[PDB]
Each structure stands twice: as structure tokens, then as C-alpha cells.
Amino acid sequence: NQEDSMIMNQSSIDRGLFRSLFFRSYMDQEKKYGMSITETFEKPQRTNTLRMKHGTYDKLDDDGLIAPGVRVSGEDVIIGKTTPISPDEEELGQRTAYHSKRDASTPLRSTENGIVDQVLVTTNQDGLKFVKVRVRTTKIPQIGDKF
């Protein structure tokens, strides 16, 4: 406990001393680029989506959102969104006629994890559909926390 350090009771920590809940919110919108381009909430597939993240899309539903109460970990996608691409653009190869969409999903923070608490879907002032997803986590005192 030297130099402004402290010693905490592990038993007290186990019993619930200085334990906290951490809520983190993510927001995403469906942007409409002109009369031609528009983004949509989707569960992108490996055969029709390009540049999709290496994470796991198993937790998404048909609407591209994780239902509340599901556990998520690092690199897990919580909001799945796709946008169309213009032809005549090949990147690192791997671009065939099958691909017609590209991923623009919002992934969970790499170091964070928890359980999805509440996801709400609504429309903004412009009428575009946007969603807000909240994730809970438990912070227990550690050997680096400040009190």
C-alpha cells in the first residue's frame, strides 16, 4: 500500500464491495445516398457481402440486430448493415459477379464484452430508420482500479 496504494479485502470484493454496472450505447442509422444508393439493416452473407469483418455474425437476426439478453464478446457484430457498391471496382481480387453488397456493420469494442440489455428501433427527424443498442457489463475491483 506504499506510495498512495491500498490493500482491499478479496472476500469483501466477492461479497459485493465497490461493484458496478457499466452500460455502453451504440447508435446506427440507415443513410440514403441520393435516389440510387441506400443502406439497409441486414445479416450479410459470405457469398454476397464484400469486406465483411472477420468477427462472428451468428448472433444477428433477420433484421440485423441482436435481441436483448444475448451475450457478446470482442469482435462480435451487434448492428449489421449493408450498402451497395458500384461495378468496375475490384479490390484484392475476390470480387465476382455474386458480390453485390458491402458490409458497413458496427462491431463491439475489442476489449469489451457483456450482455445486450436493450435495443430500440425508431426513426429520426428525417424518417430514416435508426437503432440504439445497449450493452451491460460488471466491473469488479481489481489491482489497478482507483478509489
Partner 1 sequence: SEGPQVKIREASKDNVDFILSNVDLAMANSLRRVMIAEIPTLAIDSVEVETNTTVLADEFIAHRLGLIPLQSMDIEQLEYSRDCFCEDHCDKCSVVLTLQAFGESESTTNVYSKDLVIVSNLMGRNIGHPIIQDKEGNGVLICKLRKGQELKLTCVAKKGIAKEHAKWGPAAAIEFEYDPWNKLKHTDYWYEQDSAKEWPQSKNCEYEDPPNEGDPFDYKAQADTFYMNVESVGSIPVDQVVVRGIDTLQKKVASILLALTQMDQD
Partner 2 sequence: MIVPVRCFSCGKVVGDKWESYLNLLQEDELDEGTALSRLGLKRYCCRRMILTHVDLIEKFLRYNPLEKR
Partner 3 sequence: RGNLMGKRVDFSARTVISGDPNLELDQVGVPKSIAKTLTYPEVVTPYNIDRLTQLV
Is the Cα dihedral 80, 83, 88, 89 positive or negative? negative
Q: Is 20 in the site for partner 1 (CB under 8 A)?
A: no
Is 81 exposed, middle or buried (CB count within 10 Å of its CB: 0-12, 13-18, 19+)?
Answer: buried
Which pairing describes strands 40-41 and 20-29: parallel, antiparallel, or unpaired? Answer: unpaired
Does residue number 138 form part of the binding site for partner 2 (CB under 8 A)?
no
Backbone phi, then psi, for 52, in 5-degree steps? -70, 145
Does residue 126 bind partner 3 (CB under 8 A)? Answer: no
Among 5, 47, 94, 96, interactor with partner 3 by CB under 8 A: 5
Single out the residue of 8, 70, 85, 115 in contact with partner 1 (rule: CB under 8 A): 115
Identify whether 62 is a catalytic site residue. Answer: no
At 74, is the secondary structure helix, strand, or coil? coil
Alpha helices in 1-147 (DSSP H): 10-15
Q: Which does 3 bind (CB under 5 to 8 A by kind): partner 1, partner 3, partner 2, none?
A: partner 3
Q: Is 28 annotated as a binding residue?
A: no
Binding to partner 2 by CB under 8 A, coded x per residue (else -) over 8-47, reads -x-xx--xxx------------------------------
Of 8 and 70, nearer to partner 3 (C-beta) is 8
d(CA 134, CA 77): 13
